[PDB]
């Protein structure tokens, strides 16, 4: 039969990934903390001293930063937020050393209207951070699945419009294309997915079998070109 | 030293609640941080809320207060936008500390944009939290890069002597009313800061005496941490 190493090889070839790690399904520990540890080990090998790491929001990325905090200080890694929201990055940034360089988009995650988001993106202190993010060497993001900032109603319509998952709040369909008649898209302050693709090494950290279709789609769209996930999710991706 | 005597005079002359005057007597700003952290350690009860301004005296203070903030579970909230400008201070706390940050720039490119930003739910929520704080800790600037060299010159021409949180006031302590940066700032205005019951100003340097006196006369702070020479200067203001 087949195990984690074989799932890594298959994922790597099937989605043309640059790096993949697949962690075993059960252990004496919950998946999400173990995803963090694994994403952290992958980033430690990928990042060179003084390089720049763009970070998304969410529990998996915040767990990852925690595990990476020592390497971040020791290796002088500069962190930059991929999205607005400020406070949503504090569980991961809090663990860092005071001398660590962190560049934070000083704006909300989501504006109340598209005109307001467009205004805020043009504010110099925000535009500067958006450019810095797009220029990073490596990115780490979570991946949400349609299976705080979005109402129940919006979530239901996002799904009716064919979204399967999101990165940074931007929703894409089963083929990996951004769903284009979704209003939240034009209201978000951070980097759009088309800009995220500038970053050369884009690591998704995500798991739960429920997320298989979203993770697959994210790779088919090109948004991530490296993956950290778990055994069961990997299997499900491969049959997607 | 003559420190207790300056404390008494300052307290009486400006009707202050608490005052500390540190010896003259070389690392001034470092010792003001110590001073103001000590004052805050005696004022804050467990789980109370501290509103913080930006600048180095305040960020210094925060470093020295960091273990008190953990063990007494002090909740921190930013008085202004800017985010990045608070990071040297908050980086020094651990990750179980509660820190509520205004998610917006310090200054918008126009007053309409400031006003739009202040009405965003996520900004407005933090502004209210800030105004509801138990104690505040701010620096005081003296007219003696969020602002042009050109702007700074016109701000002095308009009769400002000093600022708190980028809000400039004249020698009597009144907010200078024809300065457009005021309507571009995202944070709490000074009139709102005055809701907070204990408002501690931490500032020193003889050149700041006029600004510091004025801040007191306008009621923006009602507690002060400063150094001996500055105290002597304020009192002769």
Cβ separation of B87 and A104 shorter than 8 Å?
yes
For residue A153, the distance in angstroms to the closest alpha carbon of chain B comes to 19
Measured CA to CA, the distance from residue B188 to residue B128 in angstroms comes to 9
**Would an 8 Å CB–CB cutoff place B179 in contact with chain A?**
no
All residues of chain A having their beta carbon less than 8 Å from the beta carbon of residue B98 are: none
Q: Are A86 and A156 in contact, with CB atoms under 8 Å apart?
A: no
Count the Cβ atoms, other than its own, within 10 Å of residue A59.
15
Q: Does A102 touch chain B (CB under 8 A)?
A: yes
- A110 - beta bridge partners? A188
d(CA B15, CA B125): 32
Find the discontinuities in chain A where C to next N exceeds 2.5 angstroms and give the residue preceding each.
Answer: 147
Give the chain A residue nearest B97 (alpha carbons). Answer: A94
Q: In 3D, which of B29, B38, B102 has the Cα closest to residue B65?
A: B38
Cβ contact B220:B169 at 8 Å = yes
After which residues, if any, is chain B broken (C to N > 2.5 Å)? 25, 144
Residue-range domains of chain B with CATH = 1-237 (3.40.50.1360)
Distances (CA, A) of B18 to A140, B25, B39, B42, B128: 48, 22, 8, 10, 25
Say what the resolution is, in angstroms. 1.9
Q: Any chain B CB within 8 A of the CB of A4?
A: no
Considering only CB atoms, A96 lies closest to which of B83, B91, B105, namely: B91
Contact assignment for B117 to A112 by CB distance below 8 Å: no
Q: Which residue of B has its CA nearest to A104?
A: B84
Separate counts of helices (H) and strands (E) for chain B: 11, 10
Q: Is A26 exposed, middle or buried (0-12, 13-18, 19+ CB in 10 A)?
A: exposed
Q: Do A123 and B103 touch (CB under 8 A)?
A: no
Burial B64-93 (b: 16+ CB within 10 A, else e): bbbeebeeeebbbbbbbbbbbbbbbbbbbb
Say yes or no for a CB contact (<8 Å) between B91 and A97.
yes
Report the C-alpha gap between A39 and A16 in whole angstroms: 19
- Give the closest-approach CA distance of B156 to chain A in angstroms: 26
Handedness of CA B94, B95, B101, B107 (dihedral sign): positive
Look at residue A53 and give its three-state secondary structure: strand
Most A CBs within 10 Å, among B60, B62, B77, B84, to test the A interface: B84
Contact B226, B205 (CB under 8 A): no
Contact status of A133 with chain B (Cβ, < 8 Å): no
Pick A116's closest partner by Cβ from B83, B103, B116: B116
CA dihedral A214, A168, A159, A213 (to 10 degrees): 0
By the 8 A CB rule, do A143 and A167 touch?
yes
Partnered with residue B142 across adjacent β-strands are B162
Method: X-ray
Cβ atoms of B227 and B203 closer than 8 Å: no
Q: Verify whether the Cβ–Cβ distance A108 to B88 is below 8 Å.
A: no
Contacts with A107 from chain B: Cβ below 8 Å = 103-105
Residue among A83, A107, A121 with most chain B CBs within 10 A, to mutate: A107
């Amino acid at each position: 039969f087949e195990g984690c190493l074989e799932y890594e090889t298959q994922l790597r070839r099937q989605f043309s990934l640059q790096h993949v790690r697949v962690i075993p399904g059960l252990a004496d520990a919950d998946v999400g903390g173990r995803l963090g540890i694994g994403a952290a080990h992958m980033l430690m090998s990928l990042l060179q001293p003084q390089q720049m790491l763009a970070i998304g929001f969410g529990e998996a990325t915040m767990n990852t930063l925690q595990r990476l905090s020592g390497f971040i200080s020791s290796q002088q890694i500069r962190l930059v937020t991929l999205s607005g929201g400020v406070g949503s990055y504090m569980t991961g940034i809090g663990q860092l050393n005071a001398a660590c360089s962190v560049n934070i988009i000083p704006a909300p995650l989501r504006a109340s209207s598209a005109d307001i988001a467009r205004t805020l993106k043009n504010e110099n202190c925000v535009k500067d951070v958006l450019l810095a993010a797009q220029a990073a060497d490596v990115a780490i993001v979570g991946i949400g699945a349609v299976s705080g900032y979005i109402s129940q109603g919006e979530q239901l319509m996002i799904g009716r419009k064919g979204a399967v998952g999101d990165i940074l709040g931007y929703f894409f369909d089963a083929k990996g294309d951004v769903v284009t008649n979704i209003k939240i898209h034009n209201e978000l302050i951070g980097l759009p997915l088309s800009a995220l693709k500038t970053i050369p090494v884009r690591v998704g950290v995500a798991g739960g079998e429920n997320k298989a279709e979203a993770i697959a789609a994210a790779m088919k769209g090109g948004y991530i070109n490296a993956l950290v996930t778990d055994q069961d999710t990997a299997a499900a991706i491969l049959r997607s």
